[PDB]
Amino acid sequence: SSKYPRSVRRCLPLWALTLEAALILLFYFFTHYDQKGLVASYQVGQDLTVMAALGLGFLTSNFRRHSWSSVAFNLFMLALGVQWAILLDGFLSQKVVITLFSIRLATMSAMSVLISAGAVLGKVNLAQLVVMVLVEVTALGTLRMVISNIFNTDYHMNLRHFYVFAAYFGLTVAWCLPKPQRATIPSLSAMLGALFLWMFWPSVNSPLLRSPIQRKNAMFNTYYALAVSVVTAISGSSLAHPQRKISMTYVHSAVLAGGVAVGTSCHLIPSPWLAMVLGLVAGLISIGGAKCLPVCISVMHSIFSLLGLLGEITYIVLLVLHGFQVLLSIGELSLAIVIALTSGLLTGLLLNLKIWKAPHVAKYFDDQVFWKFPHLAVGF
Amino acid sequence: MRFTFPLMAIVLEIAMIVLFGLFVEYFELYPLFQDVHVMIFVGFGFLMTFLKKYGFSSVGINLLVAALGLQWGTIVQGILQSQGQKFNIGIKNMINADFSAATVLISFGAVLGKTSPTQMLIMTILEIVFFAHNEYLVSEIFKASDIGASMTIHAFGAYFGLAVAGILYRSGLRKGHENEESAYYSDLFAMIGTLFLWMFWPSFNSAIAEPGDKQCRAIVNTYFSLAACVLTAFAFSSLVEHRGKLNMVHIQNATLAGGVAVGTCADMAIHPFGSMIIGSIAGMVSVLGYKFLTPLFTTKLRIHDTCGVHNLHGLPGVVGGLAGIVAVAMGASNTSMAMQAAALGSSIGTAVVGGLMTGLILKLPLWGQPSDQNCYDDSVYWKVPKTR
Amino acid sequence: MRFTFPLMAIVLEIAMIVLFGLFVEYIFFELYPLFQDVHVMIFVGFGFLMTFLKKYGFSSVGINLLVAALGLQWGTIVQGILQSQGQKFNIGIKNMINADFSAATVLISFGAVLGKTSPTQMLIMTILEIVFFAHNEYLVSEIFKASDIGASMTIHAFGAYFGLAVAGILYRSGLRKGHENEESAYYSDLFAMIGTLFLWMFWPSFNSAIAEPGDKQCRAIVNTYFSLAACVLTAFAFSSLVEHRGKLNMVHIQNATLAGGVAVGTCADMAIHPFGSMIIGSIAGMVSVLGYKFLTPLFTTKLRIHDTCGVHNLHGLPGVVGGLAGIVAVAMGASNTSMAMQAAALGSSIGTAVVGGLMTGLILKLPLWGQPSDQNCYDDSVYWKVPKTR
Amino acid sequence: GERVQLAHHFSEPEITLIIFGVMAGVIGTILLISYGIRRL
Amino acid sequence: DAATSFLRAARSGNLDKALDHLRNGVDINTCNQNGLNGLHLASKEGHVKMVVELLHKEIILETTTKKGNTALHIAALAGQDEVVRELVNYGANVNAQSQKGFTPLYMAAQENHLEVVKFLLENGANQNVATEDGFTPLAVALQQGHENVVAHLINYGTKGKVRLPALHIAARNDDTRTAAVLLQNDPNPDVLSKTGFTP
Numbered sequence A: 001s002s003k004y005p006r007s008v009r010r011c012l013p014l015w016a017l018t019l020e021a022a023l024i025l026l027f028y029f030f031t032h033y034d035q036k037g038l039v040a041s042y043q044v045g046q047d048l049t050v051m052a053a054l055g056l057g058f059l060t061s062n063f064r065r066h067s068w069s070s071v072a073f074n075l076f077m078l079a080l081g082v083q084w085a086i087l088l089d090g091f092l093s094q095k096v097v098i099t100l101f102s103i104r105l106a107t108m109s110a111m112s113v114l115i116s117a118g119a120v121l122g123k124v125n126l127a128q129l130v131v132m133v134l135v136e137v138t139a140l141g142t143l144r145m146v147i148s149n150i151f152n153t154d155y156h157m158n159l160r161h162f163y164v165f166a167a168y169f170g171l172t173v174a175w176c177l178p179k180p181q182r183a184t185i186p187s188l189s190a191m192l193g194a195l196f197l198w199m200f201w202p203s204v205n206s207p208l209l210r211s212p213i214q215r216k217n218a219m220f221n222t223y224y225a226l227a228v229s230v231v232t233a234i235s236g237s238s239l240a241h242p243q244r245k246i247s248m249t250y251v252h253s254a255v256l257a258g259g260v261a262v263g264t265s266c267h268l269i270p271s272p273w274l275a276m277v278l279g280l281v282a283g284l285i286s287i288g289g290a291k292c293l294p295v296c297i298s299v300m301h302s303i304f305s306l307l308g309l310l311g312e313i314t315y316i317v318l319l320v321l322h323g324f325q326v327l328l329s330i331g332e333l334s335l336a337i338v339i340a341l342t343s344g345l346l347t348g349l350l351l352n353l354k355i356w357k358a359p360h361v362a363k364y365f366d367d368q369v370f371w372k373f374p375h376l377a378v379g380f
Numbered sequence B: 001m002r003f004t005f006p007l008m009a010i011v012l013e014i015a016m017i018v019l020f021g022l023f024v025e026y027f028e029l030y031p032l033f034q035d036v037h038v039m040i041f042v043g044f045g046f047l048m049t050f051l052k053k054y055g056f057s058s059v060g061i062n063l064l065v066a067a068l069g070l071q072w073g074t075i076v077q078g079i080l081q082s083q084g085q086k087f088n089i090g091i092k093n094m095i096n097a098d099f100s101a102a103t104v105l106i107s108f109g110a111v112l113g114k115t116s117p118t119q120m121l122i123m124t125i126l127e128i129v130f131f132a133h134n135e136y137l138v139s140e141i142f143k144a145s146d147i148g149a150s151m152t153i154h155a156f157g158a159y160f161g162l163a164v165a166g167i168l169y170r171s172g173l174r175k176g177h178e179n180e181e182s183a184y185y186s187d188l189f190a191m192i193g194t195l196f197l198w199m200f201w202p203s204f205n206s207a208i209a210e211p212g213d214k215q216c217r218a219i220v221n222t223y224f225s226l227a228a229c230v231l232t233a234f235a236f237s238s239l240v241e242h243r244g245k246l247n248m249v250h251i252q253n254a255t256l257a258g259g260v261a262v263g264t265c266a267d268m269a270i271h272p273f274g275s276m277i278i279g280s281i282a283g284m285v286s287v288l289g290y291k292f293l294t295p296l297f298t299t300k301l302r303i304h305d306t307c308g309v310h311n312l313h314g315l316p317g318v319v320g321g322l323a324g325i326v327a328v329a330m331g332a333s334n335t336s337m338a339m340q341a342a343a344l345g346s347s348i349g350t351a352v353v354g355g356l357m358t359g360l361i362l363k364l365p366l367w368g369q370p371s372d373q374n375c376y377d378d379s380v381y382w383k384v385p386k387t388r
Numbered sequence C: 001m002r003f004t005f006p007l008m009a010i011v012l013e014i015a016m017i018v019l020f021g022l023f024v025e026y027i028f029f030e031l032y033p034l035f036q037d038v039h040v041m042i043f044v045g046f047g048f049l050m051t052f053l054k055k056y057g058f059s060s061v062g063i064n065l066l067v068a069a070l071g072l073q074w075g076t077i078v079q080g081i082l083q084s085q086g087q088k089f090n091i092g093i094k095n096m097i098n099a100d101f102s103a104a105t106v107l108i109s110f111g112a113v114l115g116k117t118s119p120t121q122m123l124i125m126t127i128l129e130i131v132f133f134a135h136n137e138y139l140v141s142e143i144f145k146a147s148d149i150g151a152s153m154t155i156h157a158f159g160a161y162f163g164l165a166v167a168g169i170l171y172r173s174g175l176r177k178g179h180e181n182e183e184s185a186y187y188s189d190l191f192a193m194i195g196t197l198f199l200w201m202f203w204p205s206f207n208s209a210i211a212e213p214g215d216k217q218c219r220a221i222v223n224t225y226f227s228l229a230a231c232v233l234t235a236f237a238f239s240s241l242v243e244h245r246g247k248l249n250m251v252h253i254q255n256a257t258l259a260g261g262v263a264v265g266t267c268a269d270m271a272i273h274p275f276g277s278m279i280i281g282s283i284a285g286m287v288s289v290l291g292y293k294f295l296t297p298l299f300t301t302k303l304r305i306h307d308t309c310g311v312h313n314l315h316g317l318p319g320v321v322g323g324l325a326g327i328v329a330v331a332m333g334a335s336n337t338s339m340a341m342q343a344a345a346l347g348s349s350i351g352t353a354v355v356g357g358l359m360t361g362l363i364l365k366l367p368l369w370g371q372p373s374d375q376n377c378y379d380d381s382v383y384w385k386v387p388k389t390r
Numbered sequence D: 001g002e003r004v005q006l007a008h009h010f011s012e013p014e015i016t017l018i019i020f021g022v023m024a025g026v027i028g029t030i031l032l033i034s035y036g037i038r039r040l
Numbered sequence E: 001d002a003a004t005s006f007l008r009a010a011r012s013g014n015l016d017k018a019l020d021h022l023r024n025g026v027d028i029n030t031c032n033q034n035g036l037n038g039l040h041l042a043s044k045e046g047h048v049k050m051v052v053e054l055l056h057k058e059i060i061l062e063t064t065t066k067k068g069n070t071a072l073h074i075a076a077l078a079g080q081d082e083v084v085r086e087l088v089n090y091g092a093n094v095n096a097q098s099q100k101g102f103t104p105l106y107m108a109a110q111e112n113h114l115e116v117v118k119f120l121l122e123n124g125a126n127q128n129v130a131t132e133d134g135f136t137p138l139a140v141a142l143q144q145g146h147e148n149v150v151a152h153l154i155n156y157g158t159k160g161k162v163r164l165p166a167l168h169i170a171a172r173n174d175d176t177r178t179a180a181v182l183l184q185n186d187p188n189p190d191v192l193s194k195t196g197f198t199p
Ligand SMILES: CC(C)CCC[C@@H](C)[C@H]1CC[C@H]2[C@@H]3CC=C4C[C@@H](O)CC[C@]4(C)[C@H]3CC[C@]12C
Pocket: B159, B160, B162, B163, B164, B165, B166, B167, B169, B301, B302, B303, B352, B356
């Protein structure tokens, strides 16, 4: 097989333009438009957009020669995912009325895919990412619809499982990919992205809560848990390292451990000390996973999945205080995990198709595959 | 003389202080103003940092030009609105000051790497007056709807910078320059600026919109126009390059074309699919411009655009103006078609004339202009560290 | 011992958890955007402003994040104890804003000793400096009742003088003549420009976060905005003036452009007028550039006080200009505050910072926190896994 | 279901999950017991 | 249409179909619209046996495409180490330049093909040969961040031809076909090694 990348001058433009034309046609046929707090409602969605673009594009840009692709592909995936998620959430919760709240929900749905893509960035091209975006948005919408139909929950309120869904979907897709690093300036850019994610994660911890009191309590808990998690992660990076130094890449992923741990139950926490305890437990679990998971591909995605599972478990624990309820919650969690694994397997099987012109395994984590650089021999 | 720039800056600052003391007196729109502020100072500042040896000058001159521009635009716009009387300062005055700074930075993007800071101060001072007069004309005499300022800001600044670069044309730089090249980390910083502009563009297009339906319409239209514009820019960037390679200039610039071209129709009821169509067409036009029209302007028309601000602001600005005209024809807004056409034509003509006069003023060898060999180099005005 | 830093951090976190469980319980949403702007300032702008060092970006940003994360909790605890007089207190948006303010003060002090201290020393310095800063702020706000809504004296000058005092105690003879690692880089200066721009853009929210809603908050926003606008121009002009052949210095552009925001804080809510604010910004920028050009070498070589980021010329001297402007403003009728109270607040801030700095530096001087050697100063390899490539 | 059925404290998914959990516990206990033998 | 089928068989590795077409009377030196003959298509896809069979069919080894690339250029750009070795053993010019001045060493260096770089350097590739823009394999390897290629290029320097001439290798292995192809290309049978011995 030729290690030189195949020409995508006819596959990628045709695919992207066809997707955009289909999106425009569907918006024309199925979408319709529509006060005092318009700016206040827009600010939450703006924070979600800022996270999804900046933090999730630069957080994976820590690679030595794959930061361009990480950032630009994250932007492209967000732009496609919001547009497709608007239509999918309109279809599965019913025409589609487009509001700021629907834009916020589609932004969360795209954030799920952006989190999943971190396990597969550096090993796929743009068309495979488009396929992953479409399939993952459809699978998350189907999971939310099934949960709403079975457990009598709300379709928009089933978006709380997006941490665990994104993590397991990303791991499952990365498992199916063919088997195959850092620099200072890309690490600083990833630190900027991680800082933005850490600062604005309280917004993503309460976009679905309606009452102001629950949102305020959730933001308090997320803020304190995130502070505790940052302290614990920066402290314990030296413990879980053979060189006895602090790993910047580990910090980039473990800054968010407390926010992930308290994400599903930030409104149920009645006092900030419990949130701080949860953040400390999240940080210690992150240290343990960083020290143990590589022994038994993406370590950060694996510890993110472990943190999401821990957050679900502590939600189960906290829900009892505030038999059949535990069974319903565990069944919902198991259904989410099974659907995420099945959809990840399907997406990985579709991503191995030869028609996508995937990069060679020896050309992984390189921007030279997808980007033009001067003084290069082109073609044969 | 090395004392020209500090002396001129001090004199301009003293003049601004005197004008504020003579004409200037004393929270819902504050977040929008902050988003616009972040756009103007970070996104435009780092979008021009793609040059390998001109990042320092680009970001520093962006900061200085915008800082002088907000004050001078506040003064001139308040004088125009108050007809020479004293005026109070609200959030809208600061937003319009940031808009004037945006126009001046758009013009500066055309002459990046070929001008001195003194020339940039002079260009800011003249271009703010020209832009404010054109904006007052459009808003009061024509009474056209340009809530996103596709014509009064983007096209005006683009054609102003094109005229300035045409007057300041260098024969030796027509065939290219060694320093006129990008870098990996420089392009990453340019991506920082591109992402910030892309994320905060809806607040830019909805800062001065009427609260209620119009502001939400502007936000939604800008959001979906940018969303479609990113996909079309990526597709056409892959299309126009060999073997489907993505060009970093296209990804950094053409992704904002949908935000540029949706400004005129932001508050109009053009519908989300119409905004997406506008953004798609804007992205296609921007990529095609960057691929073909920029070499034509540089080599044949002798108009050198360093950042390609024409394909980002002027052509998408004209597209937005024509889109506003058509939306008026389609009944999206109750504005007059003739007034919209007159606003577009007046913006283009005033931009060209002001750029001509400003470039003629800057052409004098009195502001420490760099030589042809020292273009696109930070060492002319900055202390460059030994290591990268 | 390599286990000192994680053990101390875990013990401090457990202490914070216990204190929150013992003393902490549950206008907010109106001031939340201002709190978010202040948060972005504290964690991005100050974090990347110190990334100008070529071999210390990792340590600068990571220690900024860790110090501010511990600082918000410890400042919340101490400020709530001071305001509630030992009783339980509720948490609002203002508590978080004041916590970010305490983190800002600690980061200002950290900027003085950048590249010469260990993370354990930074944890200890945060713990002590928050107590000192909160006591001084409570004194100024309650006993003196001075108007310092932008905290030019209680935050900027305090952190600057507390940092210089730790830096003089921690002074090393080998570093007085300079250091090879104490140098900037092109992309490092670009990251420093990121931090500078974020601080410059979000400074009006910093100066107007705790202002009284209505006229005072808008006055603070407008004054900070125009003071920064004039400060940028004056900083550029004097940076061109003080250097050979009119070359612009990246340190001056990164730092002195915020001097107008620093020095307008005391007079932010006062009705100085936009022109009055632009006059202070123009002066604060001139003073900051002159300080960076001349006073920093004199302080480093003659006084044995080494300022890594030049936080003196950014926070202390502009802070004293800010305190001095407020006394002048009360004299001129901008504020109904007392001139003697403003002077006492400035003097108490300076004195408390220097007494707290010397005692924190005396504590940090013990060879128990893994202090770096003179050869390993300003190097990420002491505490971080540095990638092979840049 | 169909027609009228007697109301129970545990629903059908609940009771089948409980039965499956009890069966899994019994299977695990038997496997652990078998693993204990043939070694000592 | 038969030539198109032969080219498709060469690209797909179907050696039997290509041999059948050559037996029918299809020209060996036929090429597509881009100038790539059967040898170029075989070298792109790593079909070593097809390359050997076509070289045995008296194909022109130094044929250039419309971009000036030979078979060795295409094999080096595609990262086919075995094809590069086979082409060098049959007498491919390792210092051939394309239209824009690219060399097989440059193409191997720009694509992080360390094994191809090692083999070309051991076989006499000159890294001092620059393109029309003045870039060198070391420069393009530095630009693309290929650290191993940069290290090997710096360490090797100008060690020169350490391998034997291809005719000596053919004589050592008693390879009559390779020797016949080499003597068809280079008529001189008394080529000298560094020691001074003929094949
Ligand atoms: C803004 C654009 C689209 C329209 C207006 C273009 C005008 C303002 C500019 C663009 C190209 C310019 C010309 C380009 C080249 C030359 C040759 C030079 O030796 C003298 C100036 C001269 C003759 C310029 C005069 C001004 C010019 C005509």
